């Protein structure tokens, strides 16, 4: 069943009838994986070796957000309060590396540190900050513009208007690094030119009827994202 030489991993995978959608100037690292009903806004960065599953429920992610390296984002399926169990992420949201996100709502301009565990039914309000190593208990509300820390997260203090501006500026600074990463890639993948010819590649076992090609009218389409299939 296993033992192939060349990896079969696909960055963007669509479970049947659940297709991901990505906005413009958004960079998903080829090491990362996105499965299912995941919608991602414009100028959004998903860094390397991250998993985003929208299989049992949808995932919606805003525009100017950054997702760190070893981040798992997935949904639950149901909530005790009867609210929708989909993951909702605001517009300028920073998620640090080694963080887990499970069926929660996070409002705009929220910073989550490195090593956090956000559990099901949690509601983080606009402008909130969670320190590096913290766990948000399920079904907990974090007030807007507040700083929290601890494994059972405890209140620290309010955040001044200088801190929120700094967080927004930090969110805005991730665009050009991702743009450089994108510029390192060419629209045409050359990995197929380094493979040998197999028996099945030259002689298919069965043939299918012609239909519309998946890249019909591609010459008139701007190659905005070089990582497109």
């Amino acid at each position: 069943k296993y033992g192939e030489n060349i990896s079969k991993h696909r960055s963007l995978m669509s479970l049947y009838d659940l297709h991901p959608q990505i906005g413009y100037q958004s960079y998903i690292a080829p090491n990362s994986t996105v499965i299912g009903e995941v919608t991602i806004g414009n100028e959004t960065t998903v860094w390397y070796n991250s998993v985003i599953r929208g299989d049992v429920n949808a995932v919606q992610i805003g525009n100017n957000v950054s997702i760190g390296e070893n981040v798992v984002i997935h949904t639950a399926g149901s909530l005790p309060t009867g609210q929708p169990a989909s993951v909702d992420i605001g517009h300028y949201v920073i998620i640090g590396s080694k963080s887990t996100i499970y069926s929660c709502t996070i409002q705009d301009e929220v910073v989550i540190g490195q090593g956090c565990v956000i559990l099901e039914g949690a509601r983080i309000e606009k402008g909130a900050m969670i320190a590096a190593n913290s766990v948000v208990p399920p079904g907990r509300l974090i007030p807007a513009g507040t700083l929290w820390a601890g494994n059972p997260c405890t209140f620290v203090r309010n955040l001044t208007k200088s801190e929120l501006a700094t967080n927004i500026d930090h969110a805005k600074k991730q665009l050009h690094l991702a743009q450089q990463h994108r510029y390192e890639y060419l629209p045409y993948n050359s990995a197929y030119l380094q493979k040998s010819n197999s028996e099945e590649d030259l002689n298919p076992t069965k043939y299918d009827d012609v239909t519309i090609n998946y890249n019909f009218g591609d010459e008139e389409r701007a190659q905005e994202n070089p990582l497109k299939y």
Partner: protein
């Protein structure tokens, strides 16, 4: 200019009223353009937004002639007067 050449001041006044009212009618929508965040109004294809290049180039040409069409208006006026000179001959 042509109305003034033909000595029709009442027509000029009514066109002025129409022009100012229509100008406000048009520029009223510039207030509605303000949005909290980016709109995300693009179609998706192959998991990614579909940005058309040919329509983009057409808009580029139309934008050039909208911005700087006043410089080349003399040639269009020449051609249109040449066409219109055939009406009676």
């Amino acid at each position: 200019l042509y109305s003034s050449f033909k000595s029709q001041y009442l027509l000029i006044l009514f066109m002025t009223i129409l022009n100012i009212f229509g100008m406000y009618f048009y520029i009223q929508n510039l207030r509605f353009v303000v949005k909290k965040n980016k709109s995300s109004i693009l179609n998706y294809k192959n998991y990614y937004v579909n940005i058309n290049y040919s329509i983009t180039l057409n808009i580029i040409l139309l934008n050039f002639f909208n911005f700087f069409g006043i410089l080349f208006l003399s040639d269009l006026i020449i051609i249109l007067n040449y066409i219109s000179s055939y009406i009676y001959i």
